[PDB]
Structures are given as structure tokens and as C-alpha cells.
Amino acid sequence: LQATKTLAADVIMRSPVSWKQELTLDAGRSKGASENMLAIANGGLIGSVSKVEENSTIVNLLTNTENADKISVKIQHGSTTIYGIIIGYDKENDVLKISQLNSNSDISAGDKVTTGGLGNFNVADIPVGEVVATTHSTDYLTREVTVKLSADTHNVDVIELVGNSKLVPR
């Protein structure tokens, strides 16, 4: 069970370059934007807050080639859950990349991926997408998962920021 705080704001800038995909929203700290927040559109995860200013917020999109934000995700495979982190996006195969998996459970195409709530972006259960496949599948530590995103920001002009409202989740 979870408690969240949210803030919906207009998109006022969108980067036109593939090498830094981001949006600027017309709210920030003065209206409650926080650095733990994730960003949603169309019911699903579209990015993470990368900077909060007094009256604006920059959101780093999930379609960036490399992603340093260590966004926690989890994958449901029947009755087991596998945690990992988002590490980037393959623009030529149109899939999100996840690694640092906490399990050697089987992972199958169609398995649902949601936010995990660990680390800095500590809000769980936001839809991310569905598994396409795994690669490096027999590696001791470095199995990776590719995921088809269920949401994007195409023709979206309002984004919802969401953060955990509990002081110390535990």
C-alpha cells in the first residue's frame, strides 16, 4: 500500500534532439515539485524529474539512449517479482533496457513491468510496459531485459509528476 503526492503541469518546452530527450513543465518547487518524482502521461511512466526550479521542472524522458537515473522497476513473472533498474533505451529496436536484476527467474515476453519504488524514485506500481525479451540470458550477473513502453509523450501537453508522500518508506 502506498501514499503519493502529485502535480500536473503544462509542457512548455520539448527537446528536438535525439541525444537529450526531455520536457520542461511550467510548475516547480513553489507548487510542490520534488526531486523524487516520476513523470506520467497516458497512464504510464514517461520519465523522471531531473531538475526542479522554483517555477519549472525538467523531465528526462525514458527514450534517452543512456539513462543515469537508476529508476527502479519490477517485472512480474507469474507469482514472482524481479527487480532491476532502467539503464537506457535502444532507439533502433524501440525498447527500454533494464539490468541489475535481483533474480534468475525465467522472464517471458508479455510479463508486466511497473516501477519498483526502490532507490531515489521511490514510487512503485506505475505502469512501464511489457517484456519483449532477455539477452545475455546465461550471464552470471548481466542478464538484461528489453521492454516495450506502454506510454509516450507524443501529442501530450500535460504531464503528471508523482512522488511518494511518506517520510520514510519502510
What domains are there in the chain, each with its CATH number? Answer: 1-61+153-170 (2.40.10.340), 62-152 (2.40.10.350)
Alpha-carbon distance 40 to 81, whole Å? 22
DSSP string, 51-103: EE-SS-EEEEETT-SB--S--EEEEEETTEEEEEEEEEEETTTTEEEEE--S-
DSSP string, 10-22: EEEEE---TTS-E
Between vectors from CA 88 to CA 125 and to CA 120, what angle results, nearest 5°?
Answer: 45
- Resolution stated for this PDB structure, in Å: 1.2
Alpha-carbon distance 133 to 131, whole Å? 6
* Nearest C-alpha neighbor of 114 from the set 142, 78, 149, 88: 149
Alpha-carbon distance 79 to 74, whole Å? 13
Place of cell 509523450: 153
Determination approach: X-ray
Alpha-carbon distance 39 to 81, whole Å? 23
Alpha-carbon distance 57 to 80, whole Å? 36
Alpha-carbon distance 58 to 8, whole Å? 13
The three grid cell numbers given for residue 37, joined into one nine-digit string: 518524482
Count of all residues that appear for the chain in the document = 170
The answer to whether 117 and 164 have CB atoms below 8 angstroms apart is: yes
